[PDB]
């Protein structure tokens, strides 16, 4: 039998209609810029595959961020660089400015345009319904753009969204897990961070697509409006699907595995159990009411859905009533 195949409801054949070099990144030659142009100022972060530094380009004296990579397969470095190049100049997409090798350490280093990230202290406590609507709109601009350019990000989460609230700016970053959509293709499922993995990942359904991104956007929206970070708080990959099941109910889950004839690790059968889909109102309190609205919950419900094929698209999301004010305040 085997799993039932799936296509993407949108942007399906986008990459097919492009020159192979667009998506066949293994093909891609990298021209190394001059590592002496940049001097590193201070470390900004550390993140498993990369370290990040603020640095200055002594050619012209512009501030800049350098991401020094830890060893990864060249094919994956190529992949990140091609996607960044393909996406450069796109809405709220980080801008890759240069690529440099240390002459000795041989570690590759991506250089980006400087963007400031306002502290999560000043942010979280002062956001308000409006600001969240705004920035969710900004994220959807990026997701619709990358999806329309045949790319799925595969690691949407707070840590990969930078907000410069002084200048009401937002950038979607860390494209090192993004990959190109191709109809037919079975992809690796152990991608994204645990709280944001869609159910397709958790059940080992590999023929997924851009729709994966929309699940994690939902996971973000959820923890913002209910102020519950992370929203689905699983202790391991299995229990993660249990946390979801405990909100979205087990009935819709099994319908999903049936529709796509997915083989569930017998392990899950003894852990999922029987659960009702919960109404959103039991996550609402006094402390968070001000972010929760009928439109917020309609929007959220239409992202957080086991069946990838039935989640909103990025465009659909942008057209939802939840954003009616941000689309008018921007015209």
Ligand X SMILES: COC(=O)CN(CCCCCNCc1ccc(-c2ccccc2)c(Cl)c1)S(=O)(=O)c1ccc2ncsc2c1
75 binds ligand X (CB under 6 A): no
User: Closest approach of Cβ 29 to ligand X, in Å?
Assistant: 24
Nearer to ligand X, 173 or 201 (CB): 173
* Residues contacting 196, CB < 8 A, separation 6+: 155, 156, 157, 215, 216, 219, 220, 230
94 binds ligand X (CB under 6 A): yes
Taking residues 28 to 67 in sequence order and writing x for each that binds ligand X by CB under 6 A, - otherwise, the string is ----------------xxxx----x------------x-x
- Please say if 155 is a catalytic residue: yes
User: Closest approach of Cβ 132 to ligand X, in Å?
Assistant: 5
User: Closest approach of Cβ 188 to ligand X, in Å?
Assistant: 21
CA–CA separation, 6 and 10 (whole Å): 12
Nearer to ligand X, 83 or 94 (CB): 94
- Do the annotations mark residue 49 as ligand-binding? yes
What letter would DSSP give residue 287? Answer: T
112 binds ligand X (CB under 6 A): yes
92: left (phi over 0), alpha (psi -120 to 50) or beta: left
- Note whether 196 and 156 are within 8 A (CB): yes
User: Closest approach of Cβ 275 to ligand X, in Å?
Assistant: 26
Q: How many residues does the chain have?
A: 331
- Do the annotations mark residue 201 as ligand-binding? no
Site size with ligand X, rule: CB under 6 A: 26
- Do the annotations mark residue 46 as ligand-binding? yes
- Do the annotations mark residue 47 as ligand-binding? yes
- Do the annotations mark residue 51 as ligand-binding? yes
- Do the annotations mark residue 73 as ligand-binding? no
CA–CA separation, 259 and 250 (whole Å): 14
Token duo for residue 48: 């498993």
Q: Which residues pair with 64 in a beta bridge?
A: 55, 113
Q: 225: closest CA among 140, 294, 176?
A: 294
103 binds ligand X (CB under 6 A): no
CA–CA separation, 7 and 187 (whole Å): 13
What percent of the residues of the chain are helix, what percent strand, and what percent coil, each to the nearest 5? 40, 15, 45
161 binds ligand X (CB under 6 A): yes
CA–CA separation, 155 and 212 (whole Å): 9
Q: Which residues are annotated as a binding site?
A: 44-52, 67
State the catalytic residues.
155
Q: Which residues are annotated as a binding site for ATP?
A: 44-52, 67
Binding site for ligand X (CB under 6 A): 44-47, 52, 65, 67, 94, 112, 115, 117, 120, 123-124, 127, 132, 135-136, 158-159, 161-163, 173, 220, 224
């Amino acid at each position: 039998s085997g799993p039932v195949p799936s296509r993407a409801r949108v942007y399906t054949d986008v990459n097919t209609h492009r020159p192979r070099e667009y998506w066949d990144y293994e093909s891609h030659v990298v021209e190394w810029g001059n590592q002496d142009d940049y001097q590193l100022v201070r470390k900004l972060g550390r993140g498993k595959y990369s370290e990040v530094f603020e640095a200055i380009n002594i050619t012209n004296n512009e501030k800049v961020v350098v991401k020094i990579l830890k060893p990864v397969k060249k094919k994956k470095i190529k992949r990140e660089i091609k996607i960044l190049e393909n996406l450069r100049g796109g809405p709220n997409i980080i801008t890759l400015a240069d690529i440099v090798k240390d002459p000795v350490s041989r570690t590759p280093a991506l250089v980006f345009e400087h963007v400031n990230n306002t502290d999560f202290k000043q942010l979280y406590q002062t956001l308000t319904d409006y600001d969240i609507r705004f920035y969710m709109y900004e994220i959807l601009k990026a997701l619709d753009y990358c999806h329309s350019m045949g790319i799925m990000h595969r690691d949407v989460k707070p840590h990969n969204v930078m907000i410069d609230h002084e200048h009401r700016k937002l950038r979607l970053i860390d494209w090192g897990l993004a990959e190109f959509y191709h109809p037919g293709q079975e992809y690796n499922v152990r991608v994204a961070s645990r709280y944001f993995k869609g159910p397709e990942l958790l059940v080992d359904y590999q023929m997924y697509d851009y729709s994966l991104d929309m699940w994690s956007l939902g996971c973000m929206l959820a923890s913002m409006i209910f102020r519950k970070e992370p929203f689905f708080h699983g202790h391991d990959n299995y229990d993660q699907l249990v946390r979801i099941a405990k909100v979205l109910g087990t009935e819709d889950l099994y319908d999903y595995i049936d529709k796509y004839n997915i083989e569930l690790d017998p392990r899950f059968n003894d852990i999922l159990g029987r659960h009702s889909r919960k109404r959103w109102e039991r996550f609402v309190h006094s402390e968070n009411q001000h972010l929760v609205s009928p439109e917020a919950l309609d929007f959220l419900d239409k992202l957080l859905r086991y069946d990838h094929q039935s989640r909103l698209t990025a465009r659909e999301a942008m057209e939802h009533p939840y954003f009616y004010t941000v689309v008018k305040d921007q015209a």
